[PDB]
Amino acid sequence: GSHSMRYFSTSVSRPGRGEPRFIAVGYVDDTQFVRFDSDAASQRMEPRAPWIEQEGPEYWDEETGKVKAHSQTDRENLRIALRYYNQSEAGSHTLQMMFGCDVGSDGRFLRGYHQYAYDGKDYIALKEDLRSWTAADMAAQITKRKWEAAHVAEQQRAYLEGTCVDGLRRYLENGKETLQRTDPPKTHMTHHPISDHEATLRCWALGFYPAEITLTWQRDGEDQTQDTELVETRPAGDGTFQKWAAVVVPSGEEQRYTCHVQHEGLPKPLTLRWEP
Amino acid sequence: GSMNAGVTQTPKFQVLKTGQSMTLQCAQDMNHNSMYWYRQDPGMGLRLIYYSASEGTTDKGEVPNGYNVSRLNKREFSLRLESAAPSQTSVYFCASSESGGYEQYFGPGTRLTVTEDLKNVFPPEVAVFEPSEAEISHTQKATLVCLATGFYPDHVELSWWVNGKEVHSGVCTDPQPLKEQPALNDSRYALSSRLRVSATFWQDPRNHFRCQVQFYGLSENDEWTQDRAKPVTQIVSAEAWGRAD
Amino acid sequence: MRKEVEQDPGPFNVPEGATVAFNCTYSNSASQSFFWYRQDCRKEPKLLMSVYSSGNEDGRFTAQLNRASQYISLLIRDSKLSDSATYLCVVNMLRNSGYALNFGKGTSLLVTPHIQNPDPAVYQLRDSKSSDKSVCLFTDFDSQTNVSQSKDSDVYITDKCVLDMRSMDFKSNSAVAWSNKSDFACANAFNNSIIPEDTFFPSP
């Protein structure tokens, strides 16, 4: 199984009442481990997963340093952005940033990432090859030409193919217990009778990790999508995930319906029916 | 090429009683955000005192003791010695860069010297030593030698003037002054330069030569109690005409 | 001394037109940017060029970065007296909170011109009517010959100095020796340095 690490920054200008609020968070796959809040009392990179506490003071110092520095870098880009886009200084604006790497089952560098978004719109992004850039508009075309002549890509390529993977690897092993585990979905199904000759069969999937899961509603040996009500996967808050898809079903035809649950933590895809 | 005149420091030379306070100034016209105050001491190289990543903020560097800064504005960044100390005698460089971690552009730098007493300051004595007869006859060329000596601090620039215009061709001045007493600190310094010319030229008695030495001493606002003449910033020079066979 | 940038210092005498290679070794693996800086004696540091992994050519100058082995190289072809100066290795990296530039003590280059027709001699210059100093000049000597500081404190001998009479395209080494101390004579001075057995010693 391929694993991934992502850090996610979020700078928000609050004109005339302080420097922007900067909130960065890091995940390995679907599990988060660190965070940083420009406003929280720590003024340090705080752990979130049990296993990252394992890291020594050197790690925390350097990590704190890097992210604080990033916070400045973007606080200034928030200004640079305004000029490039001829926007007012009294408006509140949002500069989200994302960087990370992927590792294969082997632990080999799979793919790196680095991209910025001003007020929730692709601004600049490092291409798949970590050698050139893709700029959104005439605004980023400036930042692009700047970063081209500074060989910034090279700098980033070095981080992505180096520090980034090295850390992702260390973490997966450090917290092997937690991160490589695959909590299977504890699936059941309940009856919700509605009006006349009609009912609701809610297919439940609870306490599974990771969040990648696919629910199928098949009746009579035939897949059904029209009466399916599948909510976007949701967290449990305990480090697991949840999802349900209901179908409106005629009175007495309940035993003719089956639910197909595919997940990484299962030996084989599950099949569920109305069990009175 | 690039004159890097973007960064400007002032003064270029200063001298102080250990008690005295003093502030160096720095300015960058390049619209950079981050300015830095360094300190180059021989055998340790550049060490950072303070810096200023943005227009508003400042932070301590590797050696900020005895020093304090203030980034008064986007362009200006002041280094201030509240109470000088022999220890703080160095060369001080200021520099700016677009932002932190970016290539730094440096000012010309400022040579500062701190002395237990100003009575230790002395301007240079410049003397010119006319070509050797032996030389003009063997080599058909005349080497003039100029000797600036007994000056303190080592704050001096030495030019050669031939017939009212400064020359550079045929000149070679010591890269650095000499401690007359390398052991003692507060040792006076000595510089040595040489101009060379075709014997024909030097023998022509219309040809005039001057060894000029700028010295950076005290200012009339400073106080002088010593009987000797006040060692103020000045140009000591020595003179010599051509003399034929 | 503890230094994240280490650069073998010490004068590196090299003949003019010769190739010079310099190297610098950085500790902190998290270094992000790399630069060479040329600083002339008694002057300020000037950015020579930034050094990249992809390689950086600039005519006479060529420089590479080895992130793997954590060293940078600068190589100068057809070296010239002009590019005699101290070369500073400079790398940025996260000091405290904020990326910052670390400077090497710097390695100092000394390019020297080959003297076609040497004429080692030690002449005694005419006294300044108002200076009690015998003043000695050792000139036109082979660039290989190198002068040594005096055993006597009262004898002051200034190091070698290359001057260019561009006018006639002629270059000459020279070193000056002055003392007022009795028993100081021009033949005497510089005996503390190994000078050509050819050196011409007249009595003006």
Binding site: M5, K66, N77, T163 | - | -
Partner: peptide, 9 residues
């Protein structure tokens, strides 16, 4: 391991 991000738009 967070990124060494220091460049400006």
């Amino acid at each position: 391991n967070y990124n060494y991000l220091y460049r400006l738009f």
